[model samples]
Structure formats: C-alpha cells, structure tokens
Target: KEVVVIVKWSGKEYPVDLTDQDTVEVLRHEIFRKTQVRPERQKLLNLKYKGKTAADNVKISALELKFKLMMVGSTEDNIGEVVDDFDDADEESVAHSAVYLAKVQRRVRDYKIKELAPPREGKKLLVLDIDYTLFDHRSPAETGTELMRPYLHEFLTSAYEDYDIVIWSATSMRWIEEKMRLLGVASNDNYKVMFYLDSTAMISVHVPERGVVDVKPLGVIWALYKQYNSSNTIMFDDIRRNFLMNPKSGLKIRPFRQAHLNRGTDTELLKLSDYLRKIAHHCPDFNSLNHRKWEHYHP
Candidate 1:
C-alpha cells in the first residue's frame, strides 16, 4: 500500500508518496530535492511513526501508518524555537515576533523591496548601480565626471527606448544626485531617469570578513511596479555580492576605473546595449535567459 507523507520545513509543508517498499533514506532524498538540503545535513525532528522516530534504514512497511514529519536543520537558523517561546506571550506579541522573523528570513533568502516607483508599461525596468559601474568611484566627482565610461550617453539614450531607467547606488542620496548632475545624466538631451534610489533602499547582510554590508535588491523595484516582474527587469552591478538575492536578474559588468587610460576603447556598455535591445524587442522572460552568457547573444 502507498502512504501519503507530509514534510514540513520553513513554515511550509510538502506532500510526498511513500510505498511500503520504500526505505527511510529514500524519504530523506525526496525532502532534499524539494528543500535543497542534503540528506546528511537534514535533522528530522518530531517525525514519528506510532510515537517513535524511525531509523534511517527502516522500511516504510514497518510503520504501517501515514505520518507528518517536521524538519529542523537545513542551514537556515531555527526560527521555530523563537515561535515556541510565545506560548505565554500575548497574541500581539507572538504575532509581531513571527512577522519579524519572517521578514528577516525573506531578507536573507530573497531580495526585500523597500519601496516602489510609479507604474509604467511596455518597457522593462533597468536598475543601474552607480559607483564603479558607470564610472570609477575611486576618483573625486570632478575628475570622475571626465572618466565616465565611453559612450555612456549613447548607451542610456538607446536603452531609454525600451526601458525605464533607475539609478540605484550604495552611496548617499546626496552623492547620487550630485554625481548624476555632474555626469550630465540628470540633464541628458535624449532621455531622463524614471527615479533614483540610494543606500537607504539597500538591505544589510552579514558577511565573514566584511561584517554587515549593504546589498541592493531587485525586489524593491518589482514591488513598486506590479507590471515589472523578473521577466522584464534587469540589474547591473560591478560586484557579484549585490546580486546575491536575484542572481539571474543581474549582469555583472567590468568595473569602470582608471580615468587615466582606456576611455576611448571601453565598449562594455555598447555591447550591453545591444543585448538589452534584443531582450526588449523580444520581451521574453528575462529569468529564463542567462545574463552571464550574454556575450553569445546575436541579433
């Protein structure tokens, strides 16, 4: 006979089928596939058959009954323990802590959107990170203005046709605004930015050597513009860490540095413009396409 099993993890439950012939190891693998937690890493807790934990090598036939299983370990910190302490806590207090934990988990596992932009349609959202992206950040604003990546104006002008551009930077909003004006992007003749965002929009994540560092999340843009999904949004950043929450939506570009050289030969944006133009024309799901393999893109 076949039995239905409920596997609970991270406040979610997944149903799986188990036959009498199946072994406990088989069950572990099934959960691993769904949760990305390897069998060895999984610590099955509160999973019982007739009030006793099943051994790893045991056959399902021995249990003779269906079961609901709860998993406790999977790399994610245990928030259930926090939820447990709420037994005597007031209803509002319990709910608030649960909500806070959910928010923290979402920020760690996915990009959390802080704010949104005005609604628009028929174009994708292009999120651009300022420092070390469009221009070198090491140089002062006055000198960096001259070091702007080659053909930046042309790239933005071309991209404007198919995308609503947003300037997102880890720098303060003051610096972001000042740099845009200095770079002439604020007064570009061909196009204008839809909005601007700064460090206030970023999330803080803890890393080994860096301690807490800010990360730019694409979710903020998606949350604001309901029409703009991952299928129609793209982010450009020089650092890979900034895209940890939305890997597929990001295009990691070569940093723009050293105003003293390579100004005339920089064609990164020109190439990227070509890629974006094709994407905009087709309007295919952006997540389905590989941003890293964009060099292989042909007309």
Candidate 2:
C-alpha cells in the first residue's frame, strides 16, 4: 500500500511518498532528501498513526493509515540561533570563559595520561563521543558492549586514511579504556585512535532545564594540538549540549540506544564516512558548514 505524507519543518511542508512496507527510518530519509535536516536531527512532533507516534523500527504497514506528519527542530537557518541563547555573555566572553573552564577541568580531573596514535600529516581531526554516540551505553553492561554499531570497524578504517580519530567521552578514563578495548578499536591493527579523552576534557555549562552539564569544547582540543584548528576539526556527539561552545564543529548523531533491535539497520557511520571523505578532499573550513545538512553536502 502506498501512502503520501506531508512533512513540515522550518515553516515549510515537504511531501513524501512511501509504501506500507517501508519503515519509519525510510520516512526519515525521505524527509532528509526533501530538507537538509538529517534523520537524527529531525524531531517529529504530532506525527501520529493509529493514535501513536511511529518508531524507527516500526513498519509503515503497522501504522496502517498515515496522512501527514510534522517536525520541529533547528533548521539550517535557525541552527546558529539555537546556540545564541545558550549563554547571555558575548561571543568573546563565552569563548574566554570556556577556555578557562576547560583548563580547570583538565587539572581537576588530572588529565595527564594521553594514549594516542602517530599523528597523520595533513589529516583533519575527527573527535567522537563513545557512549550513546557509537555504542548503546544504556544497554545492560554485559550484553550491551557486545552490541557494537554496524559498520563501526568499517567506518574507522575508512576514516583513518583521511582524518585522525579521537575518542572523547564523559565517562571515566577506566570505563572509556575498557569500552574501547572491548570494541576492538584498541586492539585492531587497522584502526588508530589519535587520542583518548575522558570527562576531564569536558567543560561545565549551565543548561536551562538540565541545570549544569559537562560539555566538550573544541578549544581544549585545539589548545593541546596547536596544529589542529576549528577549520579542520569536527566533533560527533548524540547530545547537542556537548557542543555548546562550538556548535559549528559539532555533529549531533542519533543516540545508539537500541543495540539489540536496530543494530542490523544502523548505517549512520557508513553514511558519515561518505560525507567525511568528501570533506577531506575539499578541505573546507568546517565552522562555515552545517553538519545537520550533511546529507546534501556537496563540497
């Protein structure tokens, strides 16, 4: 059964066509094709089918009758605005404050030990968040670690040639190291992590509803590696707040929570590999680009 749905985002309505056999994931891609908003960034609101919101794994056939859908989130034009309200101070002051906080956090956390791979000359920096970004951290401790995201090894291998990979997590150093070893990133001969950063690397920020939170700021990374600037550095995290100070350099991915069910269909890293490959060749100033619209990224 074929169905036509209208997706509204950023005050615009996008008409999408899909079949009953298609999954909600397919509908997300269709919306992405129409609008630059990535599947992960799109927050579908009031999109009800049979009086329920559709889930990623739920088939359209199960929804049975779908007429229209709506979405709300930071669109391309409003993305910058989303970060503006984060802090009341001016940009310069905010940047300065973040730098200060990062230094203090590093000292407090005793972030002295650095395990890294040999730096690749002329390669850009790709910083990743470990927990919900790459693996299902919320899953049961024992079985969850085994449920690695699909194509993770492939993503790292392909990315190694063009970008230096860095793993940054809010978790403790011990937890980070253990997870990396379990994921085979630490043991794999093919993959090399440029560095491993833990909670100490994150700066503190006061969120409106969430209160104070530890946010990963790009300045700390830049301070450590003078050669790498915002122009060539990118950070991936599931939560947008983590990139409070460096929104442009951040790419918010969908949280990898359902390891057991969605592992087979998870292709975020594979698709991201294609995007990163393009960026590596073009070597564009990353801060000028919108990562949420990476699906339509041409250069």
Candidate 3:
C-alpha cells in the first residue's frame, strides 16, 4: 500500500504515499502537513481532479504517477496544516487509545443494518471487500467479469461451505449492489452473500498521527449479531487501515490490478481459499491467529 509520489511544494520535493485512492482531496491535506500550507488554499499544477463522484474512480498514483506533482499555497507556521487516509494504523497504538475506541463506540450507534438473511448456525463469519480485494475497478476491460480477480467463484463457493458471506464495500449501497451484480457475486446461486454494507456503515476517527480518517469497525457488526464475535469472524481488505479496530481479524489481501496483464497469473484468491479452508477446520478462535501472517499460517 506504500506508494511514493514526489509532491513538489514550496521549492522542496517531499515524498508522500498516494494511498487510500490517492485523490486530490487527500493530497491537499497532506501538503499542509509538510509545509504548513492551508489545506483549502492548496493548489496543484499538472493535475486534474476527478473531483465529483459521478464518474470518479480517479487515482493520483499508478502510471497515474507522473513521478512529481507541483503544489501551490501559503506556508510557514500555519497550523491549518494540522490535518490526512491511511496506509494503516499501528494496531497496538490505536487499540490502547480511548480516543480511538470512543469513535468506534459512537460509530456503532450512527448507523443501522437492514438484514438480508438470518445468521447461519455454527458457521464462521467472512466479511469481504470489493475494490481491489475481489475485483479491480481501476482497470479497464470489455466487461466487469474480465476485471475480476481470478478464481472468485471458486473462492466464495468454497468459503460458503464453512462461512457466511458478508459484503462490506467502502462505496455506496447503490454502488455496492451495482458492482456485485455486475461481477455476478450478489446473485450467484453457488454461494449466498449474507448481507451488504456500504460507506454509511463506516466510521471516521480523529487521530493526531493520521488526522481525520475512516475505519470499518467489526464491533458494529458484532453489536447486532451476538452469534458472531471477533473470534469467529474474518475480513479481507486491500487497505490495511480499514482493519483499525479489529486489526488481527482483518487480513490485508493483495490488491488485484493491472487486469489485462496480471489477471492471467493472479491466483491470490485461489491460494487464500486453501488458507480459509485449513483455518475453518483447525482454528477455533480466529483472533488467536494472526491473519496478516496468513500465508505463514499452515495450521
């Protein structure tokens, strides 16, 4: 998730990670950090913002990386620079902070879920991510299926045997349904997706280190479903930061991009399916195991 982009600001070139979609919005806030430029006042040259969401899957990185981008604004001693998205948060640091948990507790109340199905008895929980995790939206293809990560159907179908599928995308509920249908995951008869969650279900936190950022707390899901707890659930996301609250429960799956080239060789999901299968049988408590080191987990 580390992407270095030279932000040439105030005559000095500073490198920052164009992570978490690398939009102009996040880049402006980051500019303020290095040079004390007012975030609202920051400007860019040689950059075009996909500013509106209408057709905005725009990126500031990739070949999208021009290597260097220029910044414009006022500077020096301007604390308005006190702003930031994440590559990820240090789990121990966040877990120990009451300030962080307070945000998570509050977020548990801010939204509610509409049930799509009843909980399956004796089944472990599997919360899945859409963009870059299951499918590559940034790349172009003749159809959505062509852009999907390899072995998606087999992965989910095999996963369905031991876990209940839950779709949690960081996009809108509308877009969630749209993309799932486009990729044929939502309606596939082989596997039943338990429910779906969108960006509204995510909560924002104010961390001094990362500034204001959002996280998808599994506690919210656990709060409503008593049967599913941190010990029994697992989530997969390309962005490690989304796992802020339950860092151990979230596995940062490899992002599947460069569809035309890598799709042919990308077997991330296929390999993971074996891990999931092995774990479901032996690992009774998921939190006891480190999911980030999943490839290292043979038992």
Candidate 4:
C-alpha cells in the first residue's frame, strides 16, 4: 500500500506516495520534483504513520517525517546519518561550545561588535584568528574537519565588501599563511594578513614562560596596528590572556575554552553580525581611537 507523504518547501506543501520499501531518500527527490525547491533548503518533518499491527495497513503523515539534508559540493545530499549523530551528541560538544563561550564573553565586553561598528568610516579592518577559530583539525582530540560556519562566511562576504582585512597571528608569519591556505580562508580577496607578530613590543611582565614569545598576544596585535596608525581594526582571537593584558584596547579578543574542540565561526559571526547591524543603526563608522587607551604597565 502507498503511504501518504506531505513535504513542505518554501512555505508550500506537496504530497507524495511511499510504500514500505521506499527509503527516505526516494521520497525527498519526489518531493523536490513536485515542489521545485532546491534540496538544500528543503526540510522534511512531522512524519506520522498509522499502523498498530503487523498485518494492519500503514499510513504515513508529514508530521512524523524527519529530514537530514546537506549541500555536498553544491549538490544536495541526504545527511540523515550525520544529522542523527549530531542530534544525539551533546550540542555543547557538537555546536563548538568552547568557541561559543569565547564569543559570548567578547559579546559581553561590547555589544557594539554584536551591533556592528566599523573601526572607522569608509575603512573596516576585519581580523580573524585562523586555527580553531576558523578551522578545526582533529589531532590530540577527535580528528575532524569542521570548517567556518556558513553565516560567518556570509558576514565576511557581505558586511564589508569594500573594506580591508588584516589577519594577525602570534604564530610565525610563514606558518599562519600556510595554515590559512590549508583552511581555505586565504582565498578571500579582502584580507592582508601579516602572520608573524613581534612579541617583544607588548608588556612581558605577565606573560607565561613560553621561552619563545614573551609578549602577550594582544600586545603584539596592538603594537602592530599602532605602527600603521590605523584605528578601524577589529581583532577576533580566541586567547583570553592576550585580551586581559590590554582590556582597554577594546580590541575584542574572545576566549577559546576548548582549544581542541570548538570552532569559532558561527558564534563569533553571529556576534559580529549583530554588531554590524547595530553599527549601521547608530554610529556606523566606529572610531576605535576614541577607545584606544591601551594599558601599558610601566615598570
């Protein structure tokens, strides 16, 4: 017997017939053909079936239906398995909780970033952290390739089309660029990243005994930007110590709690998107120089 299946797409509804042997994937294509909605944006849900006995006739309703779909290489693929695992897994673990926390802290520091204020008018500097922030590679932890969130990509691609980007990392200049290339973030045309930063420029009193980079990470970024006399720079990093060293800079250094797990793309981008929206409303062109009172501890 054919079961009635209702599929909703783009606010429209369509019905299909599925028998006991028809897999969920088959139903999806049938719905796609009827609704003409691309498989990526389509969702199947609320599947309801009527059957109480082994010999009883079965009827399926749209309410009982579930969908797990993804766009693979621009083609729609049923990601039911992946979605199932994701649904079962702890969202904190799967949703990049550490990254979320860090961005939340930064968001608290200034809703302005959540509000979207440019470092200045006509010139915007969007600096992003590469490792763990944008790309997560499995290593000491579960090996996985969780790229930047889609919304973050949207924010960067849309928010400042005409602005300049600066990618600064405390890691060696060579390594940062190589990592960005590997992560595919280097392909964007808006950024001018200088990977290596001089650690000696910032106050070293509170730095950990890394024996290599004595200067706090924030100090290095602050020092480099000051050299250019640029104030429209927005820094996004996952290190807290760096931001703690120069809290007054208002440079927006979010914390990375689970360095080995969470990815900072979605949470950070959401905050940035909010900030940009607010900027567009009130003080669209932000003047960072007005808040550029860096705390240089004089020994």
Best by lDDT: 3
Q: Model 1: which ten-residue window has the lowest total lDDT? A: 77-86
* Per-residue lDDT of model 4, residues 1-299, tens digit only: 34555554545455554443434444543454354343344443433344421211222232243442222212231211111111111111211234223323332342221111224345555555544445442233433234443354566665555444555443434555565665555565643333333211222121122211111334333333443223344555554233333333234333333434455433656555556444434443345333322222111
lDDT measured at residue 10 in model 4 versus the true structure, 0 to 100: 48
The root-mean-square deviation over C-alpha atoms between each candidate and the true structure, in angstroms, is: 15.9, 18.6, 13.1, 22.2
Candidate 3: list runs displaced more than 4 Å.
Answer: 1-91, 96-102
Best-performing candidate as measured by TM-score:
3
Give the 10-residue window scoring lowest on summed lDDT in candidate 3: 77-86
Mark the 10 consecutive residues where model 4 has the least summed lDDT: 83-92
Q: How big is the positional error of residue 236 in model 4, measured in Å on the Cα after superposition?
A: 1.5
Deviation of model 3 at 188, angstroms: 1.2
Candidate 2 residue-pair clash tally: 0
Where is model 1 more than 4 Å wrong at Cα? 1-119, 140-145, 206-213
Write candidate 2's Cα lDDT for 1-299 as tens digits: 65677887877878775555556776775565456465688898876666877777677677545455778765341121112235332222254564345444444444464757767788899999886677876555565345688888999999888889898876557777877887888878887898788765554443434434446777776766777889999888877767776777888887676688888788999999999899888856877787888899986
Better of 3 and 4 by TM-score: 3
Model 2 regions lying over 4 Å from their true place:
1-93, 96-110, 141-145, 207-211
Write down the lDDT of every candidate, Cα atoms only: 0.67, 0.70, 0.73, 0.39
User: What's the lDDT for candidate 4?
Assistant: 0.39
